[PDB]
Design a protein around this ligand. Sequence first.
Ligand SMILES: C[C@@H](CCC(=O)O)C(=O)O
Ligand SMILES: C[C@@H](CCC(=O)O)C(=O)O
Lengths: 292, 291
Amino acid sequence: TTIAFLGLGNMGAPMSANLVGAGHVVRGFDPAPTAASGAAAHGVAVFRSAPEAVAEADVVITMLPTGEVVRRCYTDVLAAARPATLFIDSSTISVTDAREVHALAESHGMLQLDAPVSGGVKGAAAATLAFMVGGDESTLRRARPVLEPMAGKIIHCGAAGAGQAAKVCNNMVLAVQQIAIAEAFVLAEKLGLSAQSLFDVITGATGNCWAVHTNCPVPGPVPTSPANNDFKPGFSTALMNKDLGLAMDAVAATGATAPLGSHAADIYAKFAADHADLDFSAVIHTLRARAD
Amino acid sequence: MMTTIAFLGLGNMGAPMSANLVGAGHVVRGFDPAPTAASGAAAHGVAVFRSAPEAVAEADVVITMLPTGEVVRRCYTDVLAAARPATLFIDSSTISVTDAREVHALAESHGMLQLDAPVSGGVKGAAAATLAFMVGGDESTLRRARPVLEPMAGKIIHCGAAGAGQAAKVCNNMVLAVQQIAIAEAFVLAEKLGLSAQSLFDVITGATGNCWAVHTNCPVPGPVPTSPANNDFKPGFSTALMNKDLGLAMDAVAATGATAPLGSHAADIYAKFAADHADLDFSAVIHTLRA
Ligand SMILES: C[C@@H](CCC(=O)O)C(=O)O
Ligand SMILES: C[C@@H](CCC(=O)O)C(=O)O
């Protein structure tokens, strides 16, 4: 299988290296020379334009920063692609943008999936990414052998856009949970309840979630959590802020009522102005900026 | 070790808790000022008394299961002088941290041992003896108390000094309230986006957002057939009770000067929902997010 990989950034570079390692012919494009060089070092044939990368490909994967860039990439390359080429967008973009680009690709007789990922650069390098996939079951089946070498998990979420929707809903819940957990630890400390005692109680009770059992925002109870390593990501505030921006777009576009999600979105937007480079669990230390 | 226990408060939680103590071979001396409550407890073997001071007079252990801090304080004031010196008082009521520490000090000033030991599990947990006791007070006192708590309990966890049981419960339940609202928001947003309830359920439960509020208390019918959404939102854990716990969380927040932006938002949402939907499971808050 020949794969054109468009977007060879912090995620795209290690993803494409895993595809090379699984026996695929990988063709590539990135507008950053440092990204392109790094990708060529691990076996990707890099081209000067995306239409060139796509010309001989059975599969075209996009990993790009915004819906606008994904859409422009599609209109740039679709005429260059061969018929029934499989397009996989693994960018994280809005549900609306995902569906528009899916419809565009299928208008050209391509097969298309949205397949955004969770797991970050670490997951990308380790080939343990979780792909949340929207599109046809038969298209996903065809895509599976390409996805497998990048993936720890592959989940079919529904029709086009469902992958983006599922990821955005989960990460909105996560953001709320990470703040709620942080509030709980600060309240406990002011009440004279130790961090370890609260940890032991919450992890054995109804409040338990990844935000505490793995991402515990106070040092000690989970030695590997970012709180014990100066809040090094992990999962950066910058990226959580980005996902919440998309959750808010989804909320605006549907007219949905999401008071805690929107409050979390506000909290992380403000926090990202100062601490974008910290793990999102570091929000524990910005709660007194909220003080009224 | 078989003991004489006074049980003050024989309501929805108190009655089944006391029945398990009788079943374990303890002599249980009960009082409740609602005769209906007392009648039910008597039917399962509790010796019911005319007054709280009478029930307390010959007890090694005194358990209170009462609705508010005010009622606990009132009870302690009426009974502490009647109890034998160095009687062990366990308050399994859910009351504010401040109230718990006040009544703990009151008990100790009268020469009594005292623990706060609020419980989770509701009436079903109470009947099955699978309650979780979250305990605050002295380690040795808890040691003394264990044989009494064991026949009512699935879990006994020591949380710290007096008040820490209440603190741990109120922190956990604040988080829960926030999570239940957030899960409801996700499911409604998913529906407006064309993502099926089953699909969202499968994703969140396999991902970082998983929590009891979704995996056990899923607010949409279908993915978890045992959840309240499939049974007309019959509790479960009532909105009335969650609103009570959120009131206590807001008391703790006010007393400490903590900032809890989402916990306080969740308290405001549940306070409004409880006005007309007190009798529904707290997952029913999902109704507020739909038009
Ligand atoms: C187990 C995984 C296969 C892909 C991989 O593990 O590389 C999956 O089925 O998603
Ligand atoms: C829960 C308590 C034992 C009592 C019981 O299972 O009823 C314990 O395991 O500490």
